[PDB]
Amino acid sequence: MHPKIFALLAKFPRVELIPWETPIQYLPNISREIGADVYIKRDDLTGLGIGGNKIRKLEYLLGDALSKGADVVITVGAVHSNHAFVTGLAAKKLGLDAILVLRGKEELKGNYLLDKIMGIETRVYDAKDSFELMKYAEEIAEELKREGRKPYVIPPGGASPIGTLGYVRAVGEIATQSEVKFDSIVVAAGSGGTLAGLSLGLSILNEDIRPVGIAVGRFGEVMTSKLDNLIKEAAELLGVKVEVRPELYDYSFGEYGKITGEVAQIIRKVGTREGIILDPVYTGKAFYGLVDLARKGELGEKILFIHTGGISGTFHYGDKLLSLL
Amino acid sequence: MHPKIFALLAKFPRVELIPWETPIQYLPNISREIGADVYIKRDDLTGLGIGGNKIRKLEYLLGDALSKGADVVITVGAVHSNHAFVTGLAAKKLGLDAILVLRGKEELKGNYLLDKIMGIETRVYDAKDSFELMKYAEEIAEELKREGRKPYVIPPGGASPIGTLGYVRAVGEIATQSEVKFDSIVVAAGSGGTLAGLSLGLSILNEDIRPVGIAVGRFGEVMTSKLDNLIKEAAELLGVKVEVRPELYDYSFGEYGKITGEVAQIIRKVGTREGIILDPVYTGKAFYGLVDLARKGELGEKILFIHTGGISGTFHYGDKLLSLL
Numbered sequence A, B: 001m002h003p004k005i006f007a008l009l010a011k012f013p014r015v016e017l018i019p020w021e022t023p024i025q026y027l028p029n030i031s032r033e034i035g036a037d038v039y040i041k042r043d044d045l046t047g048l049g050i051g052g053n054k055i056r057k058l059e060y061l062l063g064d065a066l067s068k069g070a071d072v073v074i075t076v077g078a079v080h081s082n083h084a085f086v087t088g089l090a091a092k093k094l095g096l097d098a099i100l101v102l103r104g105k106e107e108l109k110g111n112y113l114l115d116k117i118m119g120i121e122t123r124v125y126d127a128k129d130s131f132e133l134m135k136y137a138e139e140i141a142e143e144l145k146r147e148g149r150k151p152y153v154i155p156p157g158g159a160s161p162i163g164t165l166g167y168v169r170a171v172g173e174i175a176t177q178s179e180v181k182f183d184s185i186v187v188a189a190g191s192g193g194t195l196a197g198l199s200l201g202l203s204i205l206n207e208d209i210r211p212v213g214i215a216v217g218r219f220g221e222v223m224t225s226k227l228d229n230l231i232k233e234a235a236e237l238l239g240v241k242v243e244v245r246p247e248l249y250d251y252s253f254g255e256y257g258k259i260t261g262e263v264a265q266i267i268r269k270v271g272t273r274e275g276i277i278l279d280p281v282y283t284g285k286a287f288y289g290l291v292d293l294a295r296k297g298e299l300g301e302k303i304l305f306i307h308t309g310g311i312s313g314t315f316h317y318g319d320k321l322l323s324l325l
């Protein structure tokens, strides 16, 4: 842990969910093929529930919830939401109650299934947007605080300002553990929250390292706008300045959730060549974006890929993947 | 890594699949309830594919396969086999070919689905026993060595002698990393291979620690007999002596694969109380056996539970679990 990032995060409360540093590995076969050195940081091994990036955010999001004495945590997402499941699981683990506000086919699979198995309260709506649901949560919240109860509402993907500190911390971890001079750090971009933290983090260490995001869905308008809005807000929390511009490419393949044979092909490749399991909605596309950029000599010689989890999506959208291979 | 276990394993070849020590955590809520300190070693985070215990065995099983120049690895199990999937994945990762000889409903779920997604060659038979298939593999093998090819056949659950060294090594890791004086180490028992390694390992360090196995299926006859046969064979490999008697209780709930509301209840409990996901076929029953023994004050004050993976079984047998909660 870098002394600087350590001192800057010192005054922030957090619940310690991750009790260790996730490992970083070199990918020999992938590296040989793309003509660049690619490493992977294993945040799919963060340990709570299905692991992944959202666990780092929850340490702060839940630290914040406990601080306000919340007794019920509410958040949203698609039915296949990784964020929703682990948010519910982590909240119950801390004696809190949770209500997941989802959207999508109510099939017993993936994280939705996991939600039911753990007995997490699930409320599915006809909505279309992930922020559309935000008002439905604000419904269950704004009211639930009538039965006395205090509610704590978390934005999509934990894209809150303190949530973002999760990856400021991750940068600190990576700085101290790795013995590699990285050229860029490639991460999938959903809410842009993880990317935001990595950006601010690198910025704080004044590292000439390119934080590269791979948008897996709706590129940007109010997205590319909240990204910057996310970066400056968390940077204000750290009472720090923000080095301008986190890169962002589009490999959503048209739309969030769209599953393609090229994404399916990357999942099988990385799986059988590095023994690592990626997912159809996030990491698979993100890594696809990695191989693409890399081969076009646009990411440098040493690339660190953040594995943000999502194995549930591979069980969930499994057959759509088969039917494409 | 204990110098002794280190020197004893020095002359054995292995492929390094796991690049780090899996963590050990204390379980506060579970510990409060059962009235004993229970810790968990995270071998569900071994990293390759779905992780788990079989990865430790494969480092030796595959080291052995490469040494004999094998070009095709063959093994067996039920369709939901964790061993079969990761064996196939690790073999392909090392440029080897694999043929999985399974048995069960050909439903696209769990590890079976994963098998197809990664494109691992799958051959399902009408057999009933896991050793019944052993002859069918020995069919595909004994013959496949006609098209020139050399085959390497792995026993059920990697229950081979060198495979067992995987957990002799694990004991070495645990000895050096933990700062806890354990009373017993509880692990699920399928082929008894993992238990065998832990036993021999503790025996080698002459630790007054009780290796406790939890049979999740057919207790023992030719099982309880191969266990001892496994322990002495691997101990002969290490040119060492064997301290007599690894404990073994039955919590199979009648039969291997049988899923019950008590096993389903433990999966939900440990999940919502420790944020850790267990599985219906192995760890859930094993941990059930933990809580039972513990409460009966029969495991001691400090208990180390080995998490051997299996998350796939929770996606696979998910609905059977719901319908029980």
Ligand SMILES: *Cc1c(COP(=O)(O)O)cnc(C)c1O
Binding pocket: A052, A053, A054, A082, A083, A157, A159, A188, A189, A190, A191, A192, A193, A194, A195, A279, A282, A283, A308, A309, A310, A311
């Ligand atoms: C939620 C998620 C992401 C995206 O995180 P953002 O902070 O929204 O960019 C990427 N990968 C996986 C597996 C996820 O679950």
Ligand SMILES: *Cc1c(COP(=O)(O)O)cnc(C)c1O
Binding pocket: B052, B053, B054, B082, B083, B157, B159, B188, B189, B190, B191, B192, B193, B194, B195, B279, B282, B283, B308, B309, B310, B311
């Ligand atoms: C295979 C397996 C076991 C049993 O291992 P043995 O070496 O056969 O005792 C236990 N738990 C899980 C999750 C497994 O996949």
